[PDB]
Amino acid sequence: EVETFAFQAEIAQLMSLIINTFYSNKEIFLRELISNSSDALDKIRYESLTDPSKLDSGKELHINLIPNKQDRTLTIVDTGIGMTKADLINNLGTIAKSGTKAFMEALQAGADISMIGQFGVGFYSAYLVAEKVTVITKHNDDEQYAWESSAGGSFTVRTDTGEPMGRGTKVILHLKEDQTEYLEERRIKEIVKKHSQFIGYPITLFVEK
Numbered sequence: 001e002v003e004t005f006a007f008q009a010e011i012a013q014l015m016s017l018i019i020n021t022f023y024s025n026k027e028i029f030l031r032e033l034i035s036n037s038s039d040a041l042d043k044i045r046y047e048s049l050t051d052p053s054k055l056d057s058g059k060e061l062h063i064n065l066i067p068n069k070q071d072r073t074l075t076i077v078d079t080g081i082g083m084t085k086a087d088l089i090n091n092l093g094t095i096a097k098s099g100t101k102a103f104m105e106a107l108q109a110g111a112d113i114s115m116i117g118q119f120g121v122g123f124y125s126a127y128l129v130a131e132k133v134t135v136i137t138k139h140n141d142d143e144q145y146a147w148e149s150s151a152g153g154s155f156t157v158r159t160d161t162g163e164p165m166g167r168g169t170k171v172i173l174h175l176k177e178d179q180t181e182y183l184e185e186r187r188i189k190e191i192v193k194k195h196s197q198f199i200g201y202p203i204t205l206f207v208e209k
């Protein structure tokens, strides 16, 4: 059973801008998603300081980067706090309407797309490199859900029948045909070293057969 939702008009506008603007510095998508992962890990760590049972769904706090050249996907997995179904529908836990408004004013006032994370909507930079994004998530207070969008104004949400996650979020980037450099080990390593050197969780880059 799949539910289909329309993006708020302002978020559809943000996604179209990300997809249509000529902007060569696409690599910042990975910094933005790793930063969201770290924020999510901070949240469950803070909750665990006063309630250790919040880690019963998994004590390890980490980020994994999983390229798959056969599927042409880059997956970013974190064991952070996760998202409820309500969170997913509400723009993946962001204040995306007000963040988009601030972001587009900044762009007309000299800013560039790499600054997206300062406006709290960095998730949508995934569409710099992905034709489709799937988000699998598990929050302690809800079931496991799958969010998905190929832009075009709509997204779907469904209960996830896939591999149980324990707790956290998995962002699956179905990469555009000309963006497969982000599946190469040396390219991913370079981006992590450049932009994510001060992330306070282990970032493990998986290798492929």
Ligand SMILES: NS(=O)(=O)c1ccc(C(F)(F)F)cc1Cl
Pocket (backbone or CB within 6 Å): 032, 033, 034, 035, 036, 037, 039, 040, 076, 078, 080, 081, 082, 083, 092, 093, 123, 137, 168, 169, 171
């Ligand atoms: N930037 S991201 O897609 O890797 C991401 C990571 C974690 C979370 C959450 F907080 F919910 F766990 C949400 C997102 Cl959207």
